[PDB]
Amino acid sequence: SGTWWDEHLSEENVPFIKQLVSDEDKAQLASKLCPLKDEPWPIHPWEPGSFRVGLIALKLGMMPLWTKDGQKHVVTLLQVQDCHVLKYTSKENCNGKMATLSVGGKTVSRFRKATSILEFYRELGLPPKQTVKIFNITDNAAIKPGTPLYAAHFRPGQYVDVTAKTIGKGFQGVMKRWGFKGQPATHGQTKTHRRPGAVATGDIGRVWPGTKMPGKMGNIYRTEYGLKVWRINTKHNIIYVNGSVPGHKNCLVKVKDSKLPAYKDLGKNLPFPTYFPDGDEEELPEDLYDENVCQPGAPSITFA
Amino acid sequence: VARYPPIVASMTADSKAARLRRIERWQATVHAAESVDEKLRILTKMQF
Amino acid sequence: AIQKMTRVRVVDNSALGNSPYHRAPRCIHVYKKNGVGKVGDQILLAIKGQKKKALIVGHCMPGPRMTPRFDSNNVVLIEDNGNPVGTRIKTPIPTSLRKREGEYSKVLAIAQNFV
Amino acid sequence: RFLSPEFIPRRGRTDPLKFQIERKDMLERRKVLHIPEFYVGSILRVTTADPYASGKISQFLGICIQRSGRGLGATFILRNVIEGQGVEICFELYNPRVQEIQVVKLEKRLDDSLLYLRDALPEYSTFDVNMKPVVQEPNQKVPVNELKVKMKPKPWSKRWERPNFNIKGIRFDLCLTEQQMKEAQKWNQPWLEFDMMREYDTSKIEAAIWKEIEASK
Amino acid sequence: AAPKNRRTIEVNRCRRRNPQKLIKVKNNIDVCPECGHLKQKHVLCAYCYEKVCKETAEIRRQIGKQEGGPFKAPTIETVVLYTGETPSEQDQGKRIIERDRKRPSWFT
Amino acid sequence: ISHGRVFRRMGLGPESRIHLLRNLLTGLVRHERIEAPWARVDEMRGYAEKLIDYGKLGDTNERAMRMADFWLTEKDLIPKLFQVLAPRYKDQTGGYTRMLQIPNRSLDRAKMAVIEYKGNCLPPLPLPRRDSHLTLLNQLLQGLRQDLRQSQ
RNA sequence: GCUACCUAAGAACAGCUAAAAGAGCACACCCGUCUAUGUAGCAAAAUAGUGGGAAGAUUUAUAGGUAGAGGCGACAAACCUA
Ligand SMILES: [Mg+2]
Ligand SMILES: [Zn+2]
């Protein structure tokens, strides 16, 4: 007999558990708002060859952004909700060549997760997260499990690797899944309009692996590479990312610094372990900008 | 001030009260005829 | 946009431009890697049995936002060397031609109006 | 009171925090220049700097035929057939190359989209470029002029005779004949205007927007 | 297309006996508190719903009796009343329909 | 792809979906509880919820009368919409309907459902009433909200 | 009793333009140009649209007649119970 959390509760105990467990989520989220006044791991400066932990954000949508050369740059919104680091995995047992950290975001219901998953967060003292991503790091950057991660971890002018599951399209055919040309409509052509043509040759008595034939579109993890941050809203935790991000609106992404050789070495000015708001030195404004962006509130741009 | 629709059957439904309105829209055409020859035509046009 | 054999209009004070009878010039080529021709693209043009190079100045196709979307596909005529055929241009011409690559300073000295 | 269309969020599954962040950048731009009440029948003179010249301004006058675009990239498209030739510029409302926008004649036509003026006569769409703005009245109703246009013959750009467009700005009767009045009424589709879930009931949403507007001042 | 060679007893034996083609054992099932006929979760009782609808039948039978014929519908809210009862002062001024059985224990 | 679309396509077309919900909503104003399949109840359920919202605009509204000639197939339920159902849900702002799932039909084994207007002349349908406050799990957690009330 | 032709005595052919037209448009009807569906199909030859004729060398009901070294044929060496 499959159960759920709310199977035997009366109408007098349904609002209590709705209030109490959500207050437990808000208490543990507000107990973890001080990384530096707790005991952290040591801070190290940036070195050539060092990598940094990323974030998990939600894609709100896009608004247009205009630059001082007078061209429109579409910018997607990448809003970071409740980003905490959950686990550290060392150099020796990481099954790779870089070490890793695990980070989760989008706190979800504690009633709708497996008991093996819930014992992880119950040790940490955190609400359970929706999606857990693993970031390759070096040993220079190592952050204790439990610190919050904010939007000002990144900075404007920084190029960013973003990946998520793309919009699934179900079982699709030929001219939509792979963009082939198909057959003409009229001039004979009785039942061939969106049909795959020849698959292989005659001497091949089979079909090769990896041939393009109808199957399920989308719902795979794709990465877009080299996307500039133009702007950061610190108040609502917004990353303003250039172009389009894989996935639908209100979806969870993986926000990593770029892999591109020209765009992966320039990391001197970036705050290296994370960004810590408890440092209390030069508190960041409402909105951090790039050089080329137009300020909403700056006057009309005159090119003379 | 509130013009309610009048409570009748519909002309196109398949029932017995909708049949009786379809009888009356025939019986409106007998009332609206000009000559007696037009009345005698539509009163005896459907051979049953 | 302008593919092969669209009907366009020549906006020039030429003696070759005021064509009687079949008063609709038909293009035969676009000088791009696509068939698609935009504002400031060379095309060929067949006028009165004579094939002639031409330059797209505004089209009926919606392009970028603050650029005009002219209700007639109007095209100026040039020869192979690059200067225009005519002496005056009376139609409006967009000012998007200056930045774009090509012999377009020849055209903008002929336009009477810049809208 | 007039609430401009772009402040209304389109029906969708977008998070309302996206449109709250959008409305902050809408209202900071509106401090720079004044955006007047301009309708679909309004005539506007828009001055814009552009990066194509050496830094001059361009004043383009036109009829604001179509005012869609729902967000920070709100657009409006103007028409002029100056020197006998049609000019069609889609002006983005919040682009920072605009300096000032003003209305010449603040009026409204019977139709929500004047895209049919492409297929109308050019006499009903030409406008004097150096013409003075009309004197405005402070608190009265906006003027609606029933200036139902006459068109060119049957091969139009779009099938405006169909009732899916719902055009109420054509004198249809003298340019189109009665048999192809009836054939266009075959696409009447009378169930749409009686419907409930294809009607986006937006009355509650303006209360939060107007709360946001006046709290920004 | 036609089969080049016939499908044998073993290949059918695996295919029509797969757990995907085998029907699933459902765990959706409870016993009703009131009547005792075993119901399912997330649906109503088949016995209790047939109890109400067959009780609804003689109630709606009498609605057609007090009008007689079509296109005659009340403009007043209505209360059903069983035997051994009086109309209340809230029930004064309604169309009160009477079916001659005792008041059922599930009706309130 | 139907990401987006909330309209089940039914009937023999988009005209025929409207008329089949028009007929189904009308029996919900006369009999005030009806039986229909899941795709036909839940399509019609929103139109039943906004029937009363358009019936609370008043007797004298032209628009509430012009949709009433369409959306009620019969013409004598037009008084019943504006004078029985509308003053009954006068205080309420939403949720005037009650949709519950019925055991399946004998013919096509259809996932059928019962829909009514909340409060009626009819006998009460056996709506699923949940567990009492006197059980083992309630009384253990009644001590939770009784202890934590004294923590202020 | 299908069909090819024939005999007997019958029937049908709106409206429109024109006048006594194997005339024009166009129904009912007759035929089957092209396409699509269908191809163990609804159908051992159909359906939907588009088409040809539709007062005539027309179409059609009924009864009769010609029978295989034959009949019949505005010859397709077609048709004569798939
Ligand atoms: Mg067009
Ligand atoms: Zn029961």
**E36 CA to centre of ligand 2 in angstroms:** 6
Q: % helix / strand / coil in chain A, to the nearest 5?
A: 10, 30, 60
Domain that holds residue E101: 27-108
Is the CA virtual torsion D156, D157, D161, D167 positive or negative? negative
**Amino acid at position C87, single letter:** T
The helix-helix angle for F38-55 and F62-71 (nearest 10°) equals: 150
Q: Is F90 on the interface with E (CB under 8 A)?
A: no
Our measurement of CA B47 to C1' G57, in angstroms, reads: 40
Q: Do chains D and F touch (3 or more CB pairs under 8 A)?
A: yes
CA A160, CA A254: separation in Å to the nearest integer? 10
CA-nearest of A274, A242, A273 to A258 is A242
Q: Which residue is nearest to nucleotide G37 (CA to C1')?
A: A190
Count CB-CB contacts under 10 A for residue D151. Answer: 20
What domains are defined for chain F? 10-120 (3.90.1030.10)
**Parallel/antiparallel/unpaired status of strands A254-257 and A238-242:** unpaired
Q: % helix / strand / coil in chain E, to the nearest 5?
A: 25, 10, 65
Half-sphere exposure of D119 (CA within 13 A, CB side): 19
3-state SS assignment for residue E80: strand
Our measurement of CA E1 to C1' G38, in angstroms, reads: 18
Chains touching chain E at 3 or more Cβ pairs under 8 angstroms?
B, F
CB F50 within 8 A of CB F139: no
E53 labelled binding-site residue: no
CA A63, CA A230: separation in Å to the nearest integer? 12
CA A140, CA C18: separation in Å to the nearest integer? 76
CA F41, CA F61: separation in Å to the nearest integer? 28
**F122 is written with which tokens?**
């009819």
Our measurement of CA B46 to C1' G30, in angstroms, reads: 29
Q: Nearest residue on chain D to A77, judged by CA atoms? A: D18
**Taking the domains of chain D in order of start, what are their residue ranges?**
1-217
Ion ligand 1: protein residues whose beta carbon lies under 5 Å: D 157
F85–chain A nearest CA distance, Å = 28
Choose from D197, D201, D203 for mutation: most chain F CBs within 10 A: D197
F96–chain D nearest CA distance, Å = 16
Domain that holds residue C54: 1-115
Q: What angle do CA C94, C97, C101 make, to 5 degrees?
A: 165
CA F145, CA D173: separation in Å to the nearest integer? 75
CA A77, CA A41: separation in Å to the nearest integer? 31
- B:F CB pairs within 8 Å: 19
Choose from A3, A6, A13, A20 for mutation: most chain F CBs within 10 A: A13
Count CB-CB contacts under 10 A for residue C10. Answer: 20
**Parallel/antiparallel/unpaired status of strands A215-217 and A148-149:** unpaired
CB A294 within 8 A of CB A67: yes
**Parallel/antiparallel/unpaired status of strands A215-217 and A159-165:** unpaired
Contacts of E71 in chain B (CB under 8 A): 7-9, 17
Our measurement of CA B8 to C1' G50, in angstroms, reads: 45
Show the beta-strand stretches assigned E in chain E.
78-81, 95-98
Our measurement of CA D103 to C1' G11, in angstroms, reads: 80
CA-nearest of A251, A252, A250, A227 to A240 is A227
CA C12, CA C79: separation in Å to the nearest integer? 13
- From chain D residues 107-126, the ones with a CB under 8 A of any chain C CB are 118
Scanning every strand, the nucleotide with its C1' closest to A187's CA turns out to be G35
Query: What are phi and psi for residue F88, nearest 5 degrees?
Result: -70, -40
Q: Is E106 on the interface with F (CB under 8 A)?
A: yes
CA-nearest of A155, A97, A104 to A133 is A104
Q: Which ligand is nearest to the CA of C62?
A: 1
**Parallel/antiparallel/unpaired status of strands A72-79 and A238-242:** antiparallel
CA B37, CA B25: separation in Å to the nearest integer? 19
Our measurement of CA D62 to C1' G58, in angstroms, reads: 68
Q: What angle do CA A64, A68, A71 make, to 5 degrees?
A: 50
CA-nearest of A258, A276, A254, A292 to A55 is A254
Domains: count for chain C: 1
Secondary structure of D33-99 as H, E, C letters: CCCCCCCCCCEEEEEEECCCCCCCEEEEEEECCECCCCCCCCEEEEEECHHHCCEEEEEECCCCCEE
Of A13, A20, A169, nearest to F138 by CB-CB distance is A13
Q: Is B1 on the interface with E (CB under 8 A)?
A: no
Q: Is F83 on the interface with B (CB under 8 A)?
A: no
Query: What are phi and psi for residue F112, nearest 5 degrees?
Result: -95, 165
Q: Do D83 and C113 count as a contact with CB atoms less than 8 A apart?
A: yes
Residue located via tokens 């079509």: E70
Q: Do A10 and F148 count as a contact with CB atoms less than 8 A apart?
A: no
CA C92, CA D80: separation in Å to the nearest integer? 11
Distance between the two ends of chain B, CA-based, in angstroms? 47
Q: What angle do CA D102, D104, D106 make, to 5 degrees?
A: 95
CA distances (Å), origin D148, targets C88, D144, D169, D172, D207: 38, 11, 4, 9, 35
Domains: count for chain E: 1
CB A51 within 8 A of CB A137: yes
The residues near A136 (Cβ < 8 Å, ≥ 6 apart) are A51, A96, A98, A99, A100
Our measurement of CA D179 to C1' G25, in angstroms, reads: 18
**F110 is written with which tokens?**
């259809």
The residues near A201 (Cβ < 8 Å, ≥ 6 apart) are none
The reported resolution of this PDB entry, expressed in Å, is 3.4
Contacts of D197 in chain F (CB under 8 A): 6-7, 46-47, 50
Computed on alpha carbons and rounded to an integer, the radius of gyration of chain C in Å comes to 13
Q: Do D55 and A300 count as a contact with CB atoms less than 8 A apart?
A: no
H-state helical runs in F4-135: 14-30, 38-55, 62-71, 78-80, 86-88
CA B37, CA A168: separation in Å to the nearest integer? 74
Of F130, F144, F148, nearest to A10 by CB-CB distance is F130
| DSSP type of residue A75 | E
- Tell which strand G nucleotides have any atom below 7 Å from a protein Cβ: 35-38
**Parallel/antiparallel/unpaired status of strands C111-113 and C89-92:** parallel
Q: Is F112 on the interface with E (CB under 8 A)?
A: no
Q: Do chains D and A touch (3 or more CB pairs under 8 A)?
A: yes
Residue located via tokens 């979806």: A251
Q: Do D15 and A60 count as a contact with CB atoms less than 8 A apart?
A: yes
A158–chain D nearest CA distance, Å = 22
**Amino acid at position D12, single letter:** G
**A221 is written with which tokens?**
């993890």
**Parallel/antiparallel/unpaired status of strands C74-77 and C9-10:** parallel
Q: Is D16 on the interface with A (CB under 8 A)?
A: no
The residues near A124 (Cβ < 8 Å, ≥ 6 apart) are A84, A86, A145, A146
Computed on alpha carbons and rounded to an integer, the radius of gyration of chain E in Å comes to 27
Structure determined via: cryo-EM
CA D44, CA D114: separation in Å to the nearest integer? 14
Q: Which ligand is nearest to the CA of E52?
A: 2
Give me the DSSP letters along C44-75: EEEETTEEEEEEE---SS--STTSB--SS-EE
Chains touching chain B at 3 or more Cβ pairs under 8 angstroms?
E, F
**A94 is written with which tokens?**
């990481």
Q: Do A9 and F148 count as a contact with CB atoms less than 8 A apart?
A: no
Contacts of F59 in chain B (CB under 8 A): 2
Show the beta-strand stretches assigned E in chain C.
9-10, 42-47, 50-56, 74-77, 89-92, 111-113
Could you tell me which residues are beta bridge partners of residue D23? none
CA F36, CA A27: separation in Å to the nearest integer? 47
CA-nearest of F90, F29, F80 to F57 is F90
Query: With b meaning 16 or more CB within 10 Å and e meaning fewer, what string describes C67-86?
Result: bbbbbbbbbbbbeeeeebbb
3-state SS assignment for residue A183: coil
E57–chain B nearest CA distance, Å = 22
CA C52, CA C31: separation in Å to the nearest integer? 13
B24–chain F nearest CA distance, Å = 18
Could you tell me which residues are beta bridge partners of residue A197? none
CA A291, CA A156: separation in Å to the nearest integer? 9
| Length of chain A, in residues | 304
CA D17, CA D214: separation in Å to the nearest integer? 19
Chain A interface, Cβ < 8 Å to D: 58, 60-61, 63-64, 66, 69-70, 72, 77, 79, 233, 236, 238, 249-250, 294, 296-304
**Amino acid at position D70, single letter:** R
CB F21 within 8 A of CB F43: yes
| DSSP type of residue D120 | B
Which helix (DSSP H) or strand (DSSP E) does residue A130 occupy? Answer: strand A129-137
**Amino acid at position F48, single letter:** A
CA F33, CA F51: separation in Å to the nearest integer? 15
CA F86, CA D21: separation in Å to the nearest integer? 40
Scanning every strand, the nucleotide with its C1' closest to A189's CA turns out to be G36
Contacts of D191 in chain F (CB under 8 A): 14-15, 18
